[PDB]
Amino acid sequence: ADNYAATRYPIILVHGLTGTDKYAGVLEYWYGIQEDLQQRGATVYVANLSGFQSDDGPNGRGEQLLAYVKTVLAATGATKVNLVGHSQGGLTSRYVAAVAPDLVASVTTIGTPHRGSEFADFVQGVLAYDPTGLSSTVIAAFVNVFGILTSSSNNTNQDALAALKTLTTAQAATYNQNYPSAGLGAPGSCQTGAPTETVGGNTHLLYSWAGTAIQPTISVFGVTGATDTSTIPLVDPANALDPSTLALFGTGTVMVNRGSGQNDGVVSKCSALYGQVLSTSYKWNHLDEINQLLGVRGANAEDPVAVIRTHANRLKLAGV
């Protein structure tokens, strides 16, 4: 079945925060996903945008993605593209679908903070505790450099503070006011919207899924513990071979303590709902979603590469 993932329109993978197409030009963001899709017949491109920036704005990643979609179409002769974004990438995809509706056939978001992340609120609140404010300046300086350093093309358009702000729950509400979508439920409802939207007379298939590895367990003294359901308790090799495993269980404990409920360490189930929700049950943390830390995942986590491949075929069967 070499035409299994052969969609009519090219697939464009869109990375999230800190991303690029290849870290330091060496490590692929979407680990092993592009080769797999291609060996099953797909025409796939991986966008390379600013790892730190807001999505809208003249200098934003949205404008960057639009320019890339256009060069992908001109290069291939295709008329539309299928947009598949992870994390903040899903927000960038929504920008293009709203701004150039004729050029998009579908939008799929994987663990996307459509309503922002409680963890971002947390980080912003912490930064805001310095009465001198130097903390922001120094930390930002350091993150922007890390951006320029790791970007495949050493993109200098990095703004750590703009990116942090845009992932907060307050900011994400304004974004949704600004770029509505029939795929979103009412703000505050923790419900999805419709499975499709018709903008400019152009129809888009909308899809989403989220990982909910981090589940709250018990609460005492107003303190709530959480468990990482992706792994076998204490003993899982992924706790050892992939340092993001324990790190996201920790950031995930902060969120559960900020009232976010199930999450993947950085995005709650409620914030991730969009269009046709295929599943919110995956036992994945935020990086398991893109087969991350060199394809390492807990014993209970589903194979993210198989999930993405199956979706490419679902797109094909839907006619896009």
- Residues serving a catalytic function are 87, 264, 286
Q: Between 202 and 244, whose beta carbon lies closer to Ca ion? A: 244
Site size toward Ca ion, by CB under 5 A:
6
For residue 275, give the amino acid letter: G
Residues counted in the chain: 320
Residues 1-60 within binding reach of Ca ion (CB under 5 A): none
Closest to 47 (Cα-Cα) out of 80, 74, 18, 22: 22
User: With helix as H, strand as E and coil as C, how does 128-160 read?
Assistant: CCCCCCHHHHHHHHHHHHHHHHHCCCCCCCCCH
Q: How far is the CB of 63 from Ca ion (least distance, A)?
A: 32
d(CA 192, CA 185): 5
Residue 264 binds to Ca ion (criterion: CB under 5 A): no
Structure tokens given for 12 = 């464009």
Rg (the chain; Cα; Å): 19
Q: What are phi and psi of 35, to 5 degrees?
A: -65, -40
Residue numbers in the known binding site for Ca(2+) are 242, 288, 292, 296
Bridge partners for 223 per DSSP: 220
If one counts every other C-beta atom within 10 angstroms of the C-beta of residue 131, the result is: 7
Q: Which of 114, 297, 309, 311 binds Ca ion (CB under 5 A)?
A: 297
Q: Segment contacting Ca ion (CB under 5 A): 93-101, 181-189, 190-198, 236-244?
A: 236-244
Q: Between 159 and 236, whose beta carbon lies closer to Ca ion? A: 236
**Contact status, residue 53 vs residue 60, Cβ threshold 8 Å:** yes
Residue numbers in the known binding site for substrate are 17, 88
**Local structure of 200: helix, strand or coil:** coil
Q: Between 21 and 288, whose beta carbon lies closer to Ca ion? A: 288
Residues 50-79 within binding reach of Ca ion (CB under 5 A): none
d(CA 75, CA 208): 28
Q: How far is the CB of 305 from Ca ion (least distance, A)?
A: 13
Q: Segment contacting Ca ion (CB under 5 A): 2-10, 47-55, 281-289, 305-313?
A: 281-289
Q: Between 236 and 288, whose beta carbon lies closer to Ca ion? A: 288
**Contact status, residue 262 vs residue 224, Cβ threshold 8 Å:** no
* Residue 108, CA distances (Å) to 196, 218, 277 in order: 11, 34, 9
Q: How far is the CB of 191 from Ca ion (least distance, A)?
A: 29
Q: Segment contacting Ca ion (CB under 5 A): 45-53, 82-90, 206-214, 280-288?
A: 280-288
Q: Which of 288, 290, 304, 313 binds Ca ion (CB under 5 A)?
A: 288
Q: Which of 242, 251, 261, 274 binds Ca ion (CB under 5 A)?
A: 242
Q: Between 290 and 320, whose beta carbon lies closer to Ca ion? A: 290
d(CA 70, CA 59): 17
Residue ranges that bind Ca ion, judged by CB under 5 A: 242, 287-288, 293, 296-297
